[PDB]
């Protein structure tokens, strides 16, 4: 603002140097707290994904992920976390939002949001770079949604198989194993996969550095961990890539782990806790994912303790958290970024916050404190939000 437009002129008087410095420090704390502790929610899960897309994609927000028209969009069924479980790294690599629709009808709110993010306008045409991906079979997203999108005049690509295991492979094949690295989760590990979605969605060049312009995502593959081996299709995909398993032995057993060791020729790593919230905390504690005392931004979503389908909130927010701090833009025919990237994890908690998670946040947060705290969706108790604010010095 210009001095001719400022609302007030504050004059601070003090006797001693200490009492003045302590006032400024407290002023800094509350100024950052009231500004950057936000809640992006809306009335239902479908509105929640729209709220995230409107704020962070093709937007003039100070912390938007992109401020230019998006070319791709990822669609997931609102009650099909099983199908679109690994859809987050795809959205992030394609520079696209992840939205939710109803299984039967294409909701009008989603219709409008797709037009806004893609910059579809009756005065101009849809060119050949405008694609919409569907994650799930016809029992996840019906043919009606597929054909109504085709009547709009955009490209539609359904990524699906005969079951969740085939479907995950279709999506992961689309992401690409460009850096010889993949993540593996169990068929029952819904929250476990959700804790690694923000990490997988990070964009890194071939030397493992953050790069939102040229980097690639890390695919996630779902396997049946109640078998003695892995099937051929899965084995064909993984090839010779370093594997990280997310979950305990009761989700991915030791014999599947050994199977991946022999098929790949590389000992698989594993991050796991005692329950959903402990595994969430362990991801924060792993230095390969979030280096110690260097995280500034944090996301919070529900853990799905009461109903598993509520994990979709984190599903839509994971691509945003992986690219927070930078903004994707153009300057002519050249794509570039604006700012610097500082990825954020997603803390999973509905009613209470486990002590494991408290250690996770305290280790990861930088010594200067937290910069941004985002609450995704409604239903989260304010107890955990105040506890997170205290942990972040906010």
């Amino acid at each position: 603002t210009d001095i001719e437009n400022v609302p007030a002129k504050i004059v601070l008087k003090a006797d001693k140097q200490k009492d003045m410095k302590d006032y400024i420090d407290d002023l800094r704390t509350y100024n950052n707290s009231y500004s950057n502790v936000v809640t992006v929610a809306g009335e239902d899960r479908i509105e929640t994904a729209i709220e995230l897309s409107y704020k962070y994609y093709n937007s003039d927000d100070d912390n938007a992920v992109t401020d230019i028209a998006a070319d791709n969009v990822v669609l997931v069924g609102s009650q099909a976390i099983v199908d679109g479980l690994v859809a987050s790294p795809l959205a992030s690599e394609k520079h696209a939002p992840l939205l939710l629709t109803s299984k039967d009808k294409l909701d009008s709110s989603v219709k409008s949001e797709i037009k806004r993010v893609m910059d579809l306008k009756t005065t101009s045409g849809i060119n050949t770079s405008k694609k919409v991906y569907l994650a799930g079979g016809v029992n996840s997203i019906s043919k009606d949604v597929e054909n109504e999108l085709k009547d709009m005049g955009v490209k539609v690509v359904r990524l699906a198989g005969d079951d969740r295991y085939e479907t995950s492979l279709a999506i992961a094949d689309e992401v690409g194993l460009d850096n010889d690295k993949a993540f593996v989760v169990g068929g029952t590990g819904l929250a476990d996969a959700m804790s690694i979605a923000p990490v997988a969605s990070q964009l890194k060049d071939s030397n493992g550095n953050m790069d939102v312009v040229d980097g690639d995502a890390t695919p996630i593959v779902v396997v049946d961990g109640k078998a003695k081996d892995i099937n051929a299709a899965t084995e064909d995909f993984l090839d010779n890539a370093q594997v990280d398993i997310i979950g305990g032995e009761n989700s991915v057993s030791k014999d599947i782990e050994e199977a991946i060791d022999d098929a790949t020729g590389k000992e698989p790593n594993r991050t796991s806790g005692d329950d959903r919230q402990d595994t969430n905390a362990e991801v924060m504690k792993e230095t390969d994912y979030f280096e110690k005392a260097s995280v500034e931004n944090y996301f919070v979503a529900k853990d799905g303790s009461t109903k598993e389908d509520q994990l979709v909130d984190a599903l839509a927010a994971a691509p945003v958290a992986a690219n927070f701090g930078a903004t994707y833009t153009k300057n002519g025919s050249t794509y570039t970024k604006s700012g610097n990237v500082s990825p954020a994890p997603i803390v999973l908690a509905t009613d209470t916050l486990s002590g494991d998670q408290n250690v996770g946040v305290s280790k990861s947060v930088s010594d200067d404190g937290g910069k941004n705290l985002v609450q995704v969706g409604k239903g989260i108790a304010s107890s955990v939000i105040s506890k997170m604010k205290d942990l972040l010095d906010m």
């Binding site: 001095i3 007030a8 008087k13």
Partner: protein
């Protein structure tokens, strides 16, 4: 020559112009450039003027010029005064306030200090004999000081005068000069003379300053009068840029119990941390005064913050 900036608000504009008028009547201001919303509209040059009567009129023209503008200033508009002034008493007048302070100081200055009596010095009357004095003598015991104006320029001036024979006699019968060590048993009129103050000839005004060495010099029973010498030099062509905006001014005393808390100040307004951090970082270095974000004024730490909005 210094160049400094100042930001003032609308509800204190009459005081700000008053101050500029006061500097004009002291012959310090060379020019005043007035700008409306960063657009130069008028200029006042006081080069030829060398009399208070002439400077008073140009002071009035400044108030009449910006009266309706500043009185009806709207959110978003601004007025700027660019003032060029000189410093030093060889280039400006003494104000009445400055002369009244000097007068009090001169009146209380010590002219003859009380001694032990082991050599020549001040003696006091004790029942006919000269004994060690009970106090020191001050300039106001011998002289009286007067503030009037010059009949050529109209500037305030300071002059001194010998007290009346009545007041001086009342002193001659109690204190005197002993030209030899006093034994405390020698008659007063014989072992003491009375001090003789000189006739004042100097006046304090422009181009002059009080000469604290010569003034009230003691040479035996003689006392010199107030003496003046050439004033110290000052710099020419200092600039003060005073802006007037339509913002509410709020002052907070951190050392008070009722003051606004940093939490409640942060709910009302929005601040930039690049500036808050600039202040915090300066206060972690020495006394915290070296730098433009913190200063000491009237013995207190002061910091001025401009919120970006509410």
């Amino acid at each position: 020559p210094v160049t400094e900036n100042y930001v003032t608000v609308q509800k204190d504009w009459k005081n700000t112009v008053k101050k500029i008028q006061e500097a004009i009547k002291l012959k310090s201001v060379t020019s005043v450039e007035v700008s409306y919303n960063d657009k130069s509209v008028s200029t006042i040059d006081l080069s030829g003027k060398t009399k208070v009567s002439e400077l008073e009129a140009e002071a009035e023209n400044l108030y009449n010029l910006v009266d309706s503008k500043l009185s009806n200033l709207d959110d978003g508009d601004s007025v700027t005064f660019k003032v060029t002034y000189n410093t030093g008493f060889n280039k400006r007048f003494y104000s009445k306030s400055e002369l009244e302070k000097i007068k009090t100081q001169l009146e209380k200055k010590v002219v003859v200090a009380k001694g032990d009596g082991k050599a020549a010095g001040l003696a006091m009357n004790e029942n006919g004999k000269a004994v060690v004095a009970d106090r020191d003598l001050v300039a106001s015991d011998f002289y009286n000081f007067i503030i009037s104006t010059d009949t050529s320029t109209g500037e305030y001036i300071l002059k001194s005068e010998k007290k009346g024979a009545a007041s001086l006699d009342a002193l001659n019968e109690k204190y005197g000069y002993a030209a030899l060590a006093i034994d405390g048993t020698g008659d007063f009129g014989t072992v003491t003379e009375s001090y003789v103050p000189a006739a004042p000839t100097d006046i304090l005004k422009s181009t002059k300053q009080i000469d604290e060495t010569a003034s009230f010099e003691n040479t035996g029973k003689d006392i010199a009068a107030m003496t003046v010498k050439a004033a110290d030099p000052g710099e020419d062509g200092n600039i003060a840029n005073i802006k007037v905006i339509n913002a509410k001014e709020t002052t907070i005393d951190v050392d008070s119990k009722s003051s606004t808390s940093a939490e409640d100040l942060a709910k009302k307004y929005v601040f930039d941390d690049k500036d808050l951090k600039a202040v915090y970082d300066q206060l972690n270095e020495g006394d915290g005064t070296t730098g433009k974000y913190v200063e000491k004024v009237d013995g207190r730490y002061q910091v001025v913050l401009y919120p970006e909005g509410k």
